[PDB]
Each structure stands twice: as structure tokens, then as C-alpha cells.
């Protein structure tokens, strides 16, 4: 019974390892998404579809 308990404990540590891998992937995805938002803002400022300009009055 103690051997099987220790085996279950190893399985739990395995699960934590998988969870940490998943957290690292999510971290990378979040950084990529922040970069995408930055580039969306940049595109919106510099878009050639803009039609406005200051008016002389």
C-alpha cells in the first residue's frame, strides 16, 4: 500500500509538471497577444484609410 501511495504521489508531481508546461505556454501566448494589440494600435494610427487633417481657420 505504501508503494502504491508513493506511486500516486509521483503521479501528482507529474501532473504539476504538465500544469507548469501549460502555464509557460500560456505566458508565451499572452506576450504574443500583447504584441498583436500593440501592432493593431500602430496600424490604426498609421492607416492609409484615415481622411482627416488639421483645418486652417
Amino acid at each position: 500500500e505504501l508503494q502504491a501511495r508513493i506511486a500516486g504521489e509521483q503521479a501528482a508531481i507529474q501532473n504539476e509538471t504538465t500544469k507548469l508546461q501549460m502555464i509557460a505556454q500560456l505566458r508565451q501566448a499572452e506576450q504574443a497577444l500583447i504584441s498583436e494589440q500593440r501592432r493593431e494600435r500602430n496600424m490604426r494610427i498609421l492607416s492609409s484609410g484615415n481622411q482627416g487633417m488639421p483645418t486652417i481657420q
Binding site: 481622411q51 487633417m53 483645418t55 486652417i56 481657420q57
Partner: protein, 48 residues
């Protein structure tokens, strides 16, 4: 749309009208009657 030279030209035209054309018109209109009568009377007097 892009409108920069139309507003600028209209602004400059307004400045030239109010400050170079109207002032000249105001001065000439004020002196035209008086100078007219004075010149006519001077003509008569000098002739005599």
C-alpha cells in the same frame, strides 16, 4: 477630405479685405464728396 489651401486662401482674403481694401474704400468714400466740392469751388475761384 483634404482641405488646406481653400481655408488658407479664404483666411488671407478676409485679412486683405478687412485691412487693406475696406480701409482704402472707407477713406476714399469719406473724402470723395468734400474733395469734389472743394475742387469745383477751387476751379471757379481760380478762374475768376
Amino acid at each position: 477630405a483634404f482641405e488646406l489651401f481653400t481655408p488658407l486662401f479664404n483666411k488671407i482674403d478676409q485679412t486683405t479685405a478687412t485691412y487693406v481694401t475696406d480701409i482704402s474704400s472707407r477713406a476714399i468714400a469719406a473724402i470723395t464728396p468734400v474733395v469734389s466740392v472743394g475742387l469745383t469751388l477751387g476751379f471757379i475761384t481760380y478762374g475768376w
